C-alpha cells in the first residue's frame, strides 16, 4: 500500500513543479553544440 500514495505523492510533486527544480539542481547540462560543395576523384 505504500506504492499507492507514493504514486499520488509524485503526481502532487509534479503538478507543483518539484521534479524539474530538483532536475535543475543536478542535471542542468545543456552545453550542446548544434553549405554544399564538391569533391571527388
Amino acid at each position: 500500500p505504500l506504492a499507492v500514495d507514493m504514486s499520488t505523492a509524485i503526481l502532487q510533486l509534479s503538478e507543483e513543479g518539484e521534479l524539474e527544480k530538483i532536475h535543475r539542481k543536478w542535471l542542468n547540462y545543456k552545453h550542446e553544440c548544434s553549405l554544399s560543395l564538391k569533391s571527388f576523384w
Partner: protein
C-alpha cells in the same frame, strides 16, 4: 540568437506594443513577419457591473 536549435525558439509571439519596444531596444535584426492575427486592444479591468 540561438535560433530553433540549441534550446532556443523559432519565433516569439507577443502583442504589438511589446514588440515595438523590442525592435528599438535591439538592433535591426528582427522584423514582424506577419500581420496581427487577433486585433483586440487593452483596457482597465473593473469590478463587474461597477
Amino acid at each position: 540568437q540561438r535560433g530553433p536549435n540549441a534550446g532556443g525558439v523559432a519565433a516569439i509571439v507577443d502583442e504589438l506594443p511589446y514588440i515595438e519596444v523590442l525592435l528599438t531596444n535591439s538592433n535591426c535584426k528582427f522584423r514582424t513577419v506577419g500581420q496581427e492575427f487577433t486585433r483586440t486592444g487593452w483596457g482597465f479591468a473593473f469590478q463587474r457591473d461597477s
